[PDB]
Design a protein around this ligand. Sequence first.
Ligand SMILES: N#CC[C@]1(n2cc(C(N)=O)c(NC(=O)C3CC3)n2)CCN(Cc2ccc(C3=CCCCC3)cc2)C[C@H]1F
Ligand SMILES: N#CC[C@]1(n2cc(C(N)=O)c(NC(=O)C3CC3)n2)CCN(Cc2ccc(C3=CCCCC3)cc2)C[C@H]1F
Lengths: 286, 281
Amino acid sequence: VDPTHFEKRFLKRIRDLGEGHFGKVELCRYDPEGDNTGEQVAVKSLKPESGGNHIADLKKEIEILRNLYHENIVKYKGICTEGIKLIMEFLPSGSLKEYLPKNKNKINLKQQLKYAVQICKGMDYLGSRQYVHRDLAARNVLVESEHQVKIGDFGLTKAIETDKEYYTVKDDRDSPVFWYAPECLMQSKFYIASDVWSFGVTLHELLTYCDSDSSPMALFLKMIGPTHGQMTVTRLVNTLKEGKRLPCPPNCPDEVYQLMRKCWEFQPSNRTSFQNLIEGFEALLK
Amino acid sequence: VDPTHFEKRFLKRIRDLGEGHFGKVELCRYDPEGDNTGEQVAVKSLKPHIADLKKEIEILRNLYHENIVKYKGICTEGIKLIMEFLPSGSLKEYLPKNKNKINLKQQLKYAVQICKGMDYLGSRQYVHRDLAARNVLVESEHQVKIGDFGLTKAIETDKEYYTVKDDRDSPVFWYAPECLMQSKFYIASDVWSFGVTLHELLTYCDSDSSPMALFLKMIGPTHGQMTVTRLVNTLKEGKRLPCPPNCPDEVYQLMRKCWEFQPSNRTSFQNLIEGFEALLK
Ligand SMILES: N#CC[C@]1(n2cc(C(N)=O)c(NC(=O)C3CC3)n2)CCN(Cc2ccc(C3=CCCCC3)cc2)C[C@H]1F
Ligand SMILES: N#CC[C@]1(n2cc(C(N)=O)c(NC(=O)C3CC3)n2)CCN(Cc2ccc(C3=CCCCC3)cc2)C[C@H]1F
């Protein structure tokens, strides 16, 4: 038997974990013994809908996650074929967005800096394999335990071609624009330095314990004036050009805010790296 | 009796003409004799904004020009703007239906009449911000009139521009790049919109070669959130609407001078008037 092969007849759906880009992540139990004793797994699959090659993109995402092995990347477990499904480990603590509001008392600055280092190690591993992530946000950072996080979704991940610095996207609809670097918004070009910008925003979230009233979206929309959505993105672009950035989170020491600010240099070439952030956080943790 | 006060009791509804920015323009007969003999008028009102309608009323009341739709008065209880009725409607409805009658010479005379109406508005220090074929009314085969001023704004003396930015329903496919990027409106922003409107007139307002259709073919039906950035980016690359079918190159060149990226580089309405008059000799 192939232990990465999950038979559909044994994969009993429990409930939805997430919805997004014409598909869903569901909690299922794999129960070949039929007694509710099998392992819980997270299952990604497309709605019957599909089209503008949603299938070829999921199949690419499967092949991406299958060959990633890092302690800060969610584990591939296998596939279910029929409309293919990606099977992953289930992390019952969910994302930082679920976990941090409930665990403020147990998660102090030292733990938040450790989680920051673990996200950066994950992201630097993905960069080392020539991938741009394009969706780095607290909602995609999963909690393994109070001491460990893992990057938990790869649905926008693209390979940068060898001898090229960026990937140009066509398919655009559902962009998380409040996490996107200016080159992504203005020119739909994604560099590794674009993942750093997003990392800066995800650190802001981590340091505000993912409070909905302090989310990047809620703070950017307070900043930017009367506007349509059609006009939202262009007003956001104009604010970033003038040099406005998310404010320092409450209780956030200025030395951590300075690391975050280096993520948000307007020009990709001027931004800090992931290895540089890891160094700066470890220095704070000594 | 004030001949600009219209009594609500004698304003008989016939039908709707259009809808926009949280209200409508209806056809009514003002019929104080109650025998169906009263004049037809166009009436702009809000559903149950008020302050902006009052400003629009005060702008139009004080504009007098052969190529600007005639203010007739108000109905007060709430307020309604009463305008002259032009039964031939907008260029968007008229051109498709009258291609046999309207040749290039007549299209160039409509172009001059729009430019004269627009340069009059400019000299009163207004920026229109909504110049499109759907807002140019046909008086007759030989005469057009700018027919709606609902987005019109004053430019402050010794300022070059007005910043909106009550922004949400912009006609983006007619907007200059300063309007898209910074929400800034100059007299030169109206020259860019005129360029798009001359494109519509020269294609006899065909839906399939509207500025919107043509720009979306060019950038893709992408997202709308991202639609406007992608449009900004395409105008930066230097791409413009193509030459309409059958449109001579020297007309197209005057059109292209409306679409210089920098406002300070765009043609004036006076230069457009003279360039066309030169073509009609
Ligand atoms: N990372 C992350 C967040 C998601 N997630 C994964 C898990 C997990 N493995 O335990 C999880 N656990 C919980 O919540 C626990 C119960 C609290 N949550 C995955 C992505 N989804 C959004 C999503 C959904 C669908 C798609 C698709 C895109 C294209 C292909 C088809 C599907 C992409 C992203 C949210 C959480 F489920
Ligand atoms: N210009 C122009 C186009 C409109 N129009 C005016 C006339 C007219 N005077 O004879 C007219 N004739 C016809 O159609 C004939 C029958 C073919 N058509 C006016 C604007 N409307 C959109 C519109 C509607 C409502 C609003 C409001 C904004 C806020 C205040 C309340 C209403 C703005 C623009 C389309 C045609 F009626």
